[PDB]
Design a protein around this ligand. Structure first.
Ligand SMILES: CCCCCCCCCCCCCCCCCC(=O)OC[C@H](COP(=O)([O-])OCC(O)COP(=O)([O-])OC[C@@H](COC(=O)CCCCCCCCCCCCCCCCC)OC(=O)CCCCCCCCCCCCCCCCC)OC(=O)CCCCCCCCCCCCCCCCC
Ligand SMILES: CCCCCCCCCCCCCCCCCC(=O)OC[C@H](COP(=O)([O-])OCC(O)COP(=O)([O-])OC[C@@H](COC(=O)CCCCCCCCCCCCCCCCC)OC(=O)CCCCCCCCCCCCCCCCC)OC(=O)CCCCCCCCCCCCCCCCC
Ligand SMILES: CCCCCCCCCCCCCCCCCC(=O)OC[C@H](COP(=O)([O-])OCC(O)COP(=O)([O-])OC[C@@H](COC(=O)CCCCCCCCCCCCCCCCC)OC(=O)CCCCCCCCCCCCCCCCC)OC(=O)CCCCCCCCCCCCCCCCC
Ligand SMILES: CCCCCCCCCCCCCCCCC[C@@H](O)O[C@H](CO[C@H](O)CCCCCCCCCCCCCCC)COP(=O)(O)OCC[N+](C)(C)C
Ligand SMILES: CCCCCCCCCCCCCCCCC[C@@H](O)O[C@H](CO[C@H](O)CCCCCCCCCCCCCCC)COP(=O)(O)OCC[N+](C)(C)C
Ligand SMILES: CCCCCCCCCCCCCCCCC[C@@H](O)O[C@H](CO[C@H](O)CCCCCCCCCCCCCCC)COP(=O)(O)OCC[N+](C)(C)C
Ligand SMILES: CCCCCCCC/C=C\CCCCCCCC(=O)OC[C@H](COP(=O)(O)OCCN)OC(=O)CCCCCCC/C=C\CCCCCCCC
Ligand SMILES: CCCCCCCC/C=C\CCCCCCCC(=O)O[C@H](COC(=O)CCCCCCC/C=C/CCCCCCCC)COP(=O)(O)OCCN
Lengths: 347, 105, 71, 171, 175, 122, 115, 83, 98
């Protein structure tokens, strides 16, 4: 694919997301979603390798079904009140339809099935895009209509996402599927606090995005897509494995690392609304994510796996293209907790 | 989330089409222009939480204009009572309700 | 002139409907004759179910589809 | 929530203008020039009151003025007018363009019989002013009292007392 | 209840939807979608939407033609299925017809609420406007306002169509 | 829910309203600014480590740019955070003042008049 | 109503013609007569086997180009607006983008049939 | 100055259809911006009375508003009949 | 709500159920997608015509445009899948698991 065509398709994806986030008309939000999907399909197929065709087909079917449901919710809302502005969704049936459509777009359980498959089917750069930039538009729409979201349905889907991400990640040796299940669990954490405080949702989204960018850039630097391939990195770049272990610890929510800040900030918020059992279940369920991060840390950094003879050749060559924002990403994803009160700048 | 660039720049990308009481071509009005105008002027500036309670009368009138549920209920009741009165035969509807009227210009 | 005649025609049809309503629903438990459905007291344009509700199907078909079906 | 007030069948009685559409179109320009004042008074009442029940007398005066206009036309020369509106009425679109000789004859009769001057292109579509003694309605929409707004933000901005006050943070 | 024209058209619309949703051979699915498109055009015409109905019928006919061409190439299935050639397709078709009939019966004689609201029938002629004015078409004026009011819509739609051409040519490249 | 997005008089994308100039700016020796600079320095060290350069002394211009960028961004971030907290306190105090019936001043008894249950430890 | 009558009349006339065509003459149908025609010899495979489309990309492009004419058709009514400059700018913009898409497909060999 | 002439000659020899299309499209783009009749077209569109002109309540100090359609005040369409 | 509105809504629900229940062909599912788009067009047009929302009359046309972009997209994918398997059956899309 031509570099100019790639650049214009990336611009179209970000333009669809921006159109969703700056529009006050439901039709323009739907158009932004349509444009985003249209430009996103070829990005997943940049390398042909028919698994990418399967991933793109599954992604297209899921997103198009969600778009159809979204348009129906819009039309029902218009029918019961001649309103096109994005507001508290005067009709409840339309509100349920939109909640389900946005959950399907995000990949919340039980609409989560497509995420591991699509992430495994595409390249690491496409997975980075899909797991970071694609979450903004549905979450931005959900934040605008949060005052009308049925808490029961959203909290059920959030708990299901946390549980299913934690359980699904345990059985994975492929790194991309591990990232997908982590994404599902973090999505559940994001949407659990949305009906109570959208600033906490934005804070969790930002912290998750920086941690995910760090992890994906680290997996790009050492071209590993499996556990056994990542177990060879210590014999070529020990620093990369050390930073990967620290980032994995942060994603597990361990203090005093950055990943502890969202959960800590969410539980507290949920307690001010007299929600006690729910945060306790979510906090105990996140230990599954911690476990399957710790297993990867064991395989890649805390122990030394056997290597191969040809790795000696690789000792003579340096990484040519460098990611400039990787050091900032690692620092922001680990050493940021003391600056927690800065979250007030998000509201 | 919502980045209000239209408000910051005064651009009006899509706000012209949000409501039906907003500057139609050839000044063609919506079916419920007055009701929506009244509801909007009631609910302006007081917030959604206050508007949902204090402008409920205007919004209910606007919804009645939009869907006409009460009007259909009333007409259905009237026609049902008329059918009951005619089936046993003590109504005899007037000639101008049967087609024997003298029309006016 | 057309507006004046239209106003008189609509008002007369509404009045005839009201007079027939006063007779049809004489013995309905708590039916208030001529009761509006809107909280407001301003004029509201009739719905054509309010004007041709008590009339034959021919004039209803005319008033509804005569212009569309005319070719 | 209230009884809809309706006029009686007597109050809606009026002497009808029972001419056909082609007859009205043949005389449309002269009629618009001659009966302009009552027509504009009725239209101003209609667009200001937003209620047909409040402008019935103006409509009756409109009908009366139209009747006088047609009475004058019938009394002075009805043959040229009939010849004009017949050719107008033949056309399926009722085109002025196809009756220019009959229109000329009618105009020449009414110019000397009554002094009537046919309005030029652009005149009947002007926005005009109307002198009326009818008071301007105060609340035509029958609006309710608008709810009071949330009060205001007043005063100066001082630093937060003891900082953010978030858990152990002292700033 | 007057001439039942709108109700009959809507029922045929639903029947065509059931026909192509039972998923027989895509030839017959295209036929069912064409029938639904024509009937929906009729429905929209019965409400004063001449341009919109004709427009959607014209668009669908063209779209279906491409689908037929693609079906003959990639969805051929040596023994193509009709609605009575398989128990699954016939069962889905009968289920759709029965559900449509049950819903109509529940909403017709009585006034039942299925999901959102209820219905008594009364014919769709009740909710019309009575508006008597105009030397133009309101629908045509609203559609033509796209080039004066909807500049933003034209911009985004044109960019999307150009991107769609680029996108299809990228996807079908292969290599 | 969003608590202060719809605050009246708010400019959409300002990041620093005019009224914020009424507040004392953070000192340049603010420990939070020092932590911002420390984060920049750590980013520079990690950049040296990944690029396989002498970590402590490889690029002094690059490390200086890292520290300077972090401090520069952190200063405005601290200003916005302080302004937002001041706004929260201002609104809370105003709302308490304007709703006296909801925050009634209560005369407090002394511990010589309050009867607390005694629970022996035995 | 008149168009519905016209459609019913046309369909009825065509169906009646089919009925007379199938019920008036004498039919002698045997297996050899009704067999498929392939120039005197039996077909090798089925006619329901896949048939390759060499113009598939042009066929897909036809959908977008067909929606563009739906976008362009309200132009006679759009030419009556007061903001003539804006309407003309948007109409020319739409046509220019259509022409640019056609040019892009042409230059990248999108109009050539597959071999 | 000399390259464009050779390119145009080759295009006219090989693809006259494309040359004609580009010339006609360029003329369609440029000419409306240089024509004095575009303003006249806008004025003609503005002169068409699709809706009723609602009269104004005479407050007493609007000299430019007519009191009768045939009064000299108000917009004039004399420029149109001579066009 | 009149009977026409619930008939259109029922058509949408039927088309959604048809999409969500795959048989074998991807083309059948794409036809269900087009049917959902058509039901949305009819519903929105009926609402806009009934309420005389003049500007919104341009909305359904736009809705048609992005319908085609979805069809042309889907058809494109159907080509590529076919080129891999000689068949548009959805059972062949099973290289990636959960
Ligand atoms: C609440 C506040 C907080 C807000 C938070 C916001 C969200 C936070 C972040 C969200 C998540 C971020 C995820 C990033 C996705 C990255 C994906 C990617 O590109 O590949 C991964 C990439 C792959 O690495 P690689 O393997 O080494 O690269 C190999 C190549 O890909 C091999 O491929 P190649 O050979 O083809 O190489 C081509 C290469 C080389 O590129 C070139 O050669 C350049 C040539 C120029 C081509 C000319 C094109 C011009 C014509 C096209 C016109 C299109 C118009 C469209 C508009 C239509 C309008 C309707 O180009 C690229 O690789 C990608 C180009 C990227 C272009 C980006 C343009 C942005 C578009 C913005 C649109 C918005 C407009 C306004 C909208 C208005 C509404 C309508 O890795 C990274 O890039 C590292 C990650 C960096 C991400 C950024 C980190 C966070 C951001 C920090 C910055 C500050 C942000 C806040 C700013 C606030 C405002 C000031
Ligand atoms: C370069 C030398 C220089 O110019 O520094 C001058 C500067 C003079 O500042 P100062 O206003 O005269 O003395 C402030 C005192 O610390 C008086 O203390 P303060 O009232 O100003 O406290 C500042 C405040 C706000 O300051 C902070 O938020 C940042 C404190 C650093 C966090 C410690 C973690 C690693 C160090 O710290 C806290 O809120 C207490 C929380 C501490 C734990 C932070 C959460 C992390 C949990 C464990 C990991 O010295 C420093 O900033 C200390 C070096 C850093
Ligand atoms: C509240 C706390 C308050 C304090 C915070 C303390 C926390 C740490 C500091 C903040 C973060 C630091 C990040 C920057 C350093 C990263 C660069 C690096 O990789 O180190 C290599 C570098 C050695 O390389 P080299 O010297 O160039 O030549 C030898 C070759 O490179 C040979 O190198 P090689 O690559 O061939 O060696 C292979 C090795 C290479 O592997 C590594 O080097 C590991 C790198 C550490 C990963 C850092 C992750 C990001 C930070 C997150 C920390 C989390 C903190 C929370 C607590 C949990 C602890 C994990 O791999 C292994 O051996 C595998 C072993 C597996 C062990 C797994 C543990 C790793 C993670 C533990 C992190 C603990 C902190 C790191 C300490 C600094 C280093 O280390 C350094 O020399 C830099 C250390 C600090 C520089 C000091 C400069 C200051 C000068 C004095 C100023 C005086 C101040 C006052 C002025 C006025 C006085 C008069
Ligand atoms: C891991 C830590 C987070 C890293 C995030 C990226 C860091 C780089 C900084 C990003 C630069 C962009 C922000 C500065 C440009 C000006 C911003 C301005 O234009 O926008 C304002 C917005 O300003 C931003 O919100 C402030 C950005 C500050 C981000 C830092 C907060 C991080 C949380 C605390 C963790 C500590 C990390 C500190 C750094 C080490 C307008 O506000 P408003 O339109 O009305 O609200 C929008 C949201 N609403 C409507 C839904 C309410
Ligand atoms: C130009 C367009 C407009 C035309 C307007 C007229 C429309 C005409 C309708 C079109 C059909 C034309 C067909 C003409 C021949 C008739 C064929 C058939 O009807 O006759 C037999 C019908 O008879 C059946 O065998 C059964 C007869 C009785 C059983 C059912 C009928 C019950 C009706 C009661 C009859 C009792 C007396 C009624 C007095 C009114 C079937 O014979 P069959 O061999 O297959 O077909 C080949 C006909 N051949 C021989 C001429 C070649
Ligand atoms: C600040 C951002 C600039 C850089 C970022 C670019 C990203 C945006 C893409 C293009 C921005 C242009 C959109 C601006 C909105 C247009 C509407 C507004 O500007 O007014 C219109 C002005 O539009 C004019 O036609 C000129 C602007 C059209 C520009 C031509 C198209 C160029 C767009 C190219 C970028 C899009 C993506 C790439 C496509 C190739 C019409 O005004 P008017 O009709 O008086 O009054 C209407 C109200 N009435 C009806 C009540 C009377
Ligand atoms: C659109 C333009 C044309 C439209 C069609 C109009 C046609 C008008 C003229 C009709 C011609 C008369 C029918 C001639 C063909 C009939 C078929 C035929 O030839 O069959 C002959 C057949 C011989 O069979 P068998 O001797 O029993 O045994 C043979 C097997 N061992 O005998 C018959 O059955 C024919 C009986 C009478 C035929 C009917 C004629 C009546 C007129 C038909 C007009 C149609 C209007 C509808
Ligand atoms: C400035 C306004 C422009 C916008 C308006 C245009 C309206 C519509 C016209 C554009 C439609 C799209 C056209 C597609 C472009 C075709 C590109 C192409 O690939 O053409 C090549 C051919 O190469 C060319 O492009 C043709 C020559 C260059 C283009 C035409 C001339 C460029 C413009 C000339 C007119 C400019 C003004 C006239 C000058 C007047 C004299 C002073 C095709 O050749 P093959 O198919 O490979 O042949 C195989 C069989 N042998």
């Amino acid at each position: 694919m031509n570099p100019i065509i790639y650049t214009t398709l990336i611009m179209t994806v970000m333009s669809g997301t921006m159109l969703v986030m700056i529009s006050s008309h439901w039709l323009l939000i739907w158009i932004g979603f349509e444009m985003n999907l249209l430009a996103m399909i070829p990005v997943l197929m940049k390398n042909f390798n028919p698994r990418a065709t399967e991933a793109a087909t599954k992604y297209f079917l899921t997103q198009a079904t969600a778009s159809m449901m979204l348009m129906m919710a819009i039309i029902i809302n218009l029918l019961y009140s001649g309103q096109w502005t994005i507001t508290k969704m005067f009709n409840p049936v339309a509100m349920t339809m939109m909640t389900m459509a946005l959950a399907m777009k995000l990949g919340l359980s039980p609409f989560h099935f497509w995420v591991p498959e699509v992430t495994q089917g595409i390249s690491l750069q496409a997975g980075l895009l899909l797991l970071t930039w694609q979450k903004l538009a549905p979450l931005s729409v959900l934040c605008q209509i949060s005052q009308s979201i049925n808490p029961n349905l959203m909290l059920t889907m959030a708990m299901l996402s946390i549980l299913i991400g934690g359980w699904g990640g345990l059985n994975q040796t492929q790194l991309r599927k591990i990232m997908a299940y982590s994404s599902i669990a973090h999505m559940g954490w994001m949407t659990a606090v949305l009906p109570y405080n959208t600033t906490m949702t934005i804070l969790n989204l930002l912290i998750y995005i920086t941690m995910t960018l760090a992890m994906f850039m680290l997996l790009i630097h050492s071209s590993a897509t499996t556990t056994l391939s990542l177990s060879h990195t210590w014999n070529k770049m020990p620093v990369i494995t050390s930073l990967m272990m620290v980032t994995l610890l942060s994603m597990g929510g361990l203090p005093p690392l950055s990943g502890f800040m969202p959960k800590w900030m969410i539980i507290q918020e949920m307690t001010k609304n007299e929600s006690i059992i729910m945060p306790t279940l979510m906090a105990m369920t996140a230990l599954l994510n911690l476990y399957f991060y710790m297993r990867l840390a064991y395989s890649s950094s805390l122990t030394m796996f056997p290597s191969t003879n040809n790795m000696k050749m690789k000792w003579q060559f340096e990484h040519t293209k460098q990611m400039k924002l990787l050091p900032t990403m690692i620092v922001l994803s680990t050493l940021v907790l003391p600056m927690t009160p800065a979250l007030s700048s998000l509201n | 989330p919502f980045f209000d660039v239209q408000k910051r720049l005064g651009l009006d990308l899509d706000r012209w089409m949000t409501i039906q009481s907003a500057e139609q071509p050839h000044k063609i009005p919506g079916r419920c222009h007055a009701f929506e105008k009244e509801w909007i002027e009631c609910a302006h500036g007081i917030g959604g939480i206050r508007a949902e309670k204090e402008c409920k009368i205007e919004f209910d009138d606007f919804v009645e204009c939009l869907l006409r549920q009460k009007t259909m209920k009333r007409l259905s009741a009237i026609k049902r009572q008329r059918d009951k009165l005619i089936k046993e035969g003590k109504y005899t509807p007037p000639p101008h309700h049967l087609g024997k009227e003298d029309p006016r210009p | 002139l057309f507006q004046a005649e239209k106003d008189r025609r609509v008002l007369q049809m509404l009045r005839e409907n009201l007079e027939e309503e006063a007779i049809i629903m004489k013995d309905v438990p708590d039916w208030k004759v001529g009761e509006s459905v809107f909280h407001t007291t301003r004029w509201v344009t009739p719905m054509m179910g309010e004007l041709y509700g008590l009339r034959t199907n021919e004039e209803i078909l005319s008033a509804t589809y005569g212009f569309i079906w005319y070719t | 929530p209230g009884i809809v007030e309706l006029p009686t069948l007597e109050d809606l009685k009026v002497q009808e203008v029972k001419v056909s559409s082609s007859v009205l179109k043949a005389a449309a320009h002269h009629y618009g020039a001659q009966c302009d004042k009552p027509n504009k008074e009725f239209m101003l009442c209609r667009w200001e009151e937003k209620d047909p029940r409040r402008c019935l007398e103006e409509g009756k005066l409109v009908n009366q003025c139209a009747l006088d206009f047609f009475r004058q036309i019938k009394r002075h020369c009805a043959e040229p007018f009939t010849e004009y509106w017949t050719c107008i009425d033949y056309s399926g679109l009722q085109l002025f363009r196809h009756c220019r000789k009959q229109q000329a004859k009618f105009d020449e009769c009414v110019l000397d019989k009554l002094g009537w001057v046919r309005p030029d292109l652009g005149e009947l579509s002007k926005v005009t002013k109307v002198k009326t003694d009818r008071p301007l309605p105060e609340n035509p929409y029958h609006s309710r009292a608008r709810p009071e707004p949330n009060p205001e933000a007043e005063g100066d901005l001082k630093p937060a007392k003891h900082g953010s006050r978030l858990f152990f943070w002292t700033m | 209840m007057t001439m039942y024209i709108a109700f009959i058209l809507s029922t045929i619309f639903v029947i065509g939807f059931v026909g192509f949703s039972s998923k027989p051979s895509p030839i017959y699915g295209g036929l069912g979608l064409i029938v639904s498109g024509g009937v929906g055009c009729g429905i929209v015409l019965n409400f004063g939407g001449s341009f919109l109905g004709l427009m959607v019928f014209l668009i669908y006919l063209g779209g279906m033609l491409v689908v037929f061409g693609y079906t003959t190439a990639m969805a051929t299935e040596m023994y193509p299925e009709v609605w009575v050639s398989n128990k699954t397709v016939f069962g889905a078709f009968v289920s759709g017809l029965m559900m449509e009939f049950c819903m109509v019966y529940y909403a017709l004689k009585e006034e039942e609420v299925e999901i959102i609201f209820k219905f008594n029938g009364l014919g769709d002629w009740v909710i019309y406007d009575t508006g008597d004015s105009g030397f133009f078409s309101e629908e045509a004026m609203g559609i033509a306002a796209l080039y004066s009011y909807g500049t933003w819509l034209v911009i985004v739609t044109g960019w999307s169509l150009l991107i769609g051409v680029v996108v299809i040519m990228e996807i079908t490249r292969g290599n | 829910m969003t608590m202060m997005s719809g605050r009246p008089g708010r400019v959409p994308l300002q990041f620093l309203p005019n009224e914020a100039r009424s507040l004392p700016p953070p000192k340049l020796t603010d420990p939070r600014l020092v932590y911002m600079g420390f984060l920049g320095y750590c980013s520079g060290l990690i950049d040296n480590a990944i690029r396989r350069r002498p970590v402590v002394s490889a690029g002094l211009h690059r490390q200086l740019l890292y520290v300077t960028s972090f401090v520069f961004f952190g200063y405005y971030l601290l200003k916005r955070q302080d302004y937002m907290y001041a706004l929260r306190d201002h609104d809370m105090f105003a709302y308490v003042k304007s709703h006296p019936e909801d925050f009634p001043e209560k005369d407090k008894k002394t511990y010589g008049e309050i009867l607390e249950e005694f629970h022996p430890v035995r | 109503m008149n168009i519905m009558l016209t459609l019913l009349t046309n369909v009825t006339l065509a169906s009646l013609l089919v009925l007379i065509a199938f019920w008036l003459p004498q039919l002698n149908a045997y297996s050899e007569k009704t067999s498929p025609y392939e120039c005197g010899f039996d077909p090798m495979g089925s006619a329901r086997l896949p048939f390759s489309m060499k113009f598939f990309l042009v066929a897909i492009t036809f959908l977008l180009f067909d929606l563009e004419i739906a976008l362009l058709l309200p132009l006679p009514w759009a030419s009556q607006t007061n903001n003539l400059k804006t309407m003309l700018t948007m109409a020319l913009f739409l046509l220019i983008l259509l022409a640019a898409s056609l040019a892009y497909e042409w230059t990248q060999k999108g109009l050539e049939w597959a071999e | 100055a000399g390259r464009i002439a050779s390119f145009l000659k080759n295009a006219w020899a090989k693809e006259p259809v494309l040359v004609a299309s580009f010339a006609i499209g360029g003329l369609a783009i440029i000419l409306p911006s240089l024509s004095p009749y575009t303003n006249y077209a806008i004025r003609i569109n503005r002169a068409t009375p699709y809706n009723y002109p609602v009269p104004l309540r005479d407050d007493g100090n609007m000299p430019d508003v007519p009191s009768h359609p045939q009064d000299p005040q108000g917009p004039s369409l004399e420029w149109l009949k001579n066009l | 709500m009149p009977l026409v509105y619930m008939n259109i809504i029922m058509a949408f629900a039927i088309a959604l159920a048809g999409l969500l229940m795959y048989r074998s062909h991807l083309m059948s599912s794409l036809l269900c997608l087009e049917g959902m788009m058509l039901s949305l067009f009819i519903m929105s047009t009926l609402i806009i015509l009934n309420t005389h929302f003049t500007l919104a009359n341009m909305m359904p046309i736009i809705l048609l445009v992005f319908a085609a972009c979805e069809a042309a997209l889907g058809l494109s994918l159907l080509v590529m899948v076919s080129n891999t398997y000689g068949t548009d059956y959805v059972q062949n899309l099973n290289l990636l698991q959960c």
